[PDB]
């Protein structure tokens, strides 16, 4: 129904909620700059005894470095266990799913940087291109790869020739905004290249995939009916929220515009329609008030 | 109806035809090896006074080097004017369509090698990355780019931010077979990456695009109702043949299997169903016989 969230309703929605899931970029901050009032919403949520957790499709950085951004931008006492990234969760799914014999479960061919590789190793996954004592490659992982090349695409497809080799994508985010006003290509753009050349569909880890929620709920009980999902991207965070059965809030500090959300409601595409919208998440603090 | 082409029917089909359009790879040859009897079909067609022309989605080589392959593999007196490649035709469409003011029609940002660039220049197109006297980039061309990188993908999308900048793809061939038994990623795989990151649909030049036929018929009159289209790929050559209104022949020396064609006929997908099939194009010579 895309309701602007204020007043009596806002107080009710937040009061009933046991917890809040926050996308990060476009939500808490944009580039170098925190959304004013965002850290203090988080303080007021802790103080109201409502759980905050964070869901990021970022596969560029391992958790401990991704956590750094919080403090850097004025988000104080957040513990790394509150942060879930597609990198963390890709590492976890591969451990859960690697198809090979117990004695040698398989190597993962990874398209991604050093942060992503760390997470994978941190989960006990063997990587192709790590020094040998070559091991059979049993999954291809496509992450945000700034050094993506045709040669890598060619290698990924050679591995995927074996149909028992998994294809995994961290996310399908097509592109990402930068401070200046330019976009960077996303993982979804690289996944599309790998899918097309190999003739395969990827297993997607990050939002809007329901697996990202399975990853959050390994370490925490979350009743999605009592949880809010807050994000800036309709096709990522809002869609995620719907598939998980959460009340969705669109914040207008990021990628999607209100026009796009109103378009989808008129088209009846209810999965990409937010329950609520705030101009920025500093607008939710008012509904917690002492 | 997917009829195996022989006997009385074969003699009739070839007798009525004024001309034949041949895909090259998987049709005339595979890798280093000519299909036996293929050069002599071509001799017998000339001798029957039936026109042969050649249609290739190849954007790797400029015409004069692409022509070399013919003689190299025992295809004698073929003149370069009989050969149409997506590279040649991409060069032509860009000249026809570049959106800029008469005094400076615009530079083309190209994802492709030295062969492709030559064709583009040979048509009088200005290239980004050629030395300056930067010129405004008014088209992005995605060809077969063996040196494709994330950095190039990022640059192509920056150009495409301007919506008056054209997106052009030479072809959408996802992958290509090699002698050994491995595939190389196709242009379609790189086009999918560029499309996804930029949020745009490419203008496609090569088969199955109807534009490839417009490109052939600039230099030649072809009555498609009296022309045969022969290829190995259902989704490329057969589909092309259908959209152009030609009688389509599948040859079994290349990518598509007869099973795949029979599947599509049962699914009623008539555009990807060949009129006829031969095991190899050496089987058509018999229907010309003196
Ligand atoms: Mg976001
Ligand atoms: Mg072919």
Swiss-Prot record, chains A, B:
<dbReference type="GO" id="GO:0005911">
    <property type="term" value="C:cell-cell junction"/>
</dbReference>
<dbReference type="GO" id="GO:0032587">
    <property type="term" value="C:ruffle membrane"/>
</dbReference>
<dbReference type="GO" id="GO:0098794">
    <property type="term" value="C:postsynapse"/>
</dbReference>
<dbReference type="GO" id="GO:0007088">
    <property type="term" value="P:regulation of mitotic nuclear division"/>
</dbReference>
<dbReference type="GO" id="GO:0098978">
    <property type="term" value="C:glutamatergic synapse"/>
</dbReference>
<dbReference type="GO" id="GO:0004722">
    <property type="term" value="F:protein serine/threonine phosphatase activity"/>
</dbReference>
<dbReference type="GO" id="GO:0031258">
    <property type="term" value="C:lamellipodium membrane"/>
</dbReference>
<dbReference type="GO" id="GO:0005829">
    <property type="term" value="C:cytosol"/>
</dbReference>
<keyword id="KW-0963">Cytoplasm</keyword>
<keyword id="KW-0460">Magnesium</keyword>
<dbReference type="GO" id="GO:0005737">
    <property type="term" value="C:cytoplasm"/>
</dbReference>
<dbReference type="InterPro" id="IPR006349">
    <property type="entry name" value="PGP_euk"/>
</dbReference>
<dbReference type="GO" id="GO:0032361">
    <property type="term" value="P:pyridoxal phosphate catabolic process"/>
</dbReference>
<protein>
    <recommendedName>
        <fullName>Chronophin</fullName>
        <ecNumber>3.1.3.16</ecNumber>
        <ecNumber>3.1.3.74</ecNumber>
    </recommendedName>
</protein>
<keyword id="KW-1003">Cell membrane</keyword>
<feature type="binding site">
    <location>
        <position position="232"/>
    </location>
    <ligand>
        <name>Mg(2+)</name>
    </ligand>
</feature>
<keyword id="KW-0966">Cell projection</keyword>
<dbReference type="GO" id="GO:0031247">
    <property type="term" value="P:actin rod assembly"/>
</dbReference>
<comment type="function">
    <text>Functions as a pyridoxal phosphate (PLP) phosphatase, which also catalyzes the dephosphorylation of pyridoxine 5'-phosphate (PNP) and pyridoxamine 5'-phosphate (PMP), with order of substrate preference PLP &gt; PNP &gt; PMP and therefore plays a role in vitamin B6 metabolism. Also functions as a protein serine phosphatase that specifically dephosphorylates 'Ser-3' in proteins of the actin-depolymerizing factor (ADF)/cofilin family like CFL1 and DSTN. Thereby, regulates cofilin-dependent actin cytoskeleton reorganization, being required for normal progress through mitosis and normal cytokinesis.</text>
</comment>
<keyword id="KW-0472">Membrane</keyword>
<feature type="binding site">
    <location>
        <position position="25"/>
    </location>
    <ligand>
        <name>Mg(2+)</name>
    </ligand>
</feature>
<keyword id="KW-0479">Metal-binding</keyword>
<feature type="binding site">
    <location>
        <position position="176"/>
    </location>
    <ligand>
        <name>substrate</name>
    </ligand>
</feature>
<dbReference type="GO" id="GO:0042803">
    <property type="term" value="F:protein homodimerization activity"/>
</dbReference>
<dbReference type="GO" id="GO:0030836">
    <property type="term" value="P:positive regulation of actin filament depolymerization"/>
</dbReference>
<feature type="active site" description="Proton donor">
    <location>
        <position position="25"/>
    </location>
</feature>
<dbReference type="GO" id="GO:0006470">
    <property type="term" value="P:protein dephosphorylation"/>
</dbReference>
<feature type="active site" description="Nucleophile">
    <location>
        <position position="23"/>
    </location>
</feature>
<dbReference type="GO" id="GO:0099159">
    <property type="term" value="P:regulation of modification of postsynaptic structure"/>
</dbReference>
<feature type="binding site">
    <location>
        <begin position="56"/>
        <end position="58"/>
    </location>
    <ligand>
        <name>substrate</name>
    </ligand>
</feature>
<keyword id="KW-0378">Hydrolase</keyword>
<dbReference type="InterPro" id="IPR006357">
    <property type="entry name" value="HAD-SF_hydro_IIA"/>
</dbReference>
<keyword id="KW-0206">Cytoskeleton</keyword>
<dbReference type="GO" id="GO:0031072">
    <property type="term" value="F:heat shock protein binding"/>
</dbReference>
<dbReference type="InterPro" id="IPR023214">
    <property type="entry name" value="HAD_sf"/>
</dbReference>
<comment type="similarity">
    <text>Belongs to the HAD-like hydrolase superfamily.</text>
</comment>
<dbReference type="GO" id="GO:0033883">
    <property type="term" value="F:pyridoxal phosphatase activity"/>
</dbReference>
<dbReference type="Pfam" id="PF13242">
    <property type="entry name" value="Hydrolase_like"/>
</dbReference>
<dbReference type="GO" id="GO:0005856">
    <property type="term" value="C:cytoskeleton"/>
</dbReference>
<dbReference type="GO" id="GO:0032465">
    <property type="term" value="P:regulation of cytokinesis"/>
</dbReference>
<dbReference type="Pfam" id="PF13344">
    <property type="entry name" value="Hydrolase_6"/>
</dbReference>
<feature type="binding site">
    <location>
        <position position="23"/>
    </location>
    <ligand>
        <name>Mg(2+)</name>
    </ligand>
</feature>
């Amino acid at each position: 129904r895309c309701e602007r969230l204020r007043g009596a309703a806002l107080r009710d929605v937040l009061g009933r909620a046991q917890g809040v899931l926050f996308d990060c970029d476009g939500v808490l901050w944009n580039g170098e700059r925190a959304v004013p009032g965002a850290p203090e919403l988080l303080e007021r949520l802790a103080r109201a005894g409502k759980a905050a957790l964070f869901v990021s499709n970022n596969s560029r950085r391992a958790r401990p470095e991704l956590a750094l951004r919080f403090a850097r931008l004025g988000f104080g006492g957040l513990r790394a266990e509150q942060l879930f990234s597609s990198a963390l969760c890709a590492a976890r799914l591969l451990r859960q799913r690697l198809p090979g014999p117990p004695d040698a479960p398989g190597a993962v061919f990874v398209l991604g940087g050093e942060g992503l590789r760390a997470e994978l190793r941190a989960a006990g996954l063997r990587l192709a291109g790590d020094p040998s004592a070559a091991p059979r490659v049993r999954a291809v992982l496509v992450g945000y790869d700034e050094h993506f090349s045709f040669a890598k695409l060619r290698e990924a497809c050679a591995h995927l020739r074996d149909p028992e080799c998994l294809l995994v994508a961290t996310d399908r985010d097509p592109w990402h905004p930068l401070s200046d006003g330019s976009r960077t290509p996303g993982t979804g753009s690289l996944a599309a290249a790998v899918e097309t050349a190999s003739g395969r569909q990827a297993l997607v880890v990050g939002k809007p995939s329901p697996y990202m929620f399975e990853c959050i709920t390994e370490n925490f009980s979350i009743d999605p009916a009592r949880t809010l999902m807050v994000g800036d991207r309709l096709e990522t965070d809002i869609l995620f929220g719907h598939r998980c059965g959460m009340t969705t809030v669109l914040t207008l500090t990021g990628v999607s515009r209100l026009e796009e959300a109103q378009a989808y409601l008129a088209a009846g595409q209810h999965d990409l329609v937010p329950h609520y919208y705030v101009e920025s998440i500093a607008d939710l603090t008012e509904g917690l008030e002492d």
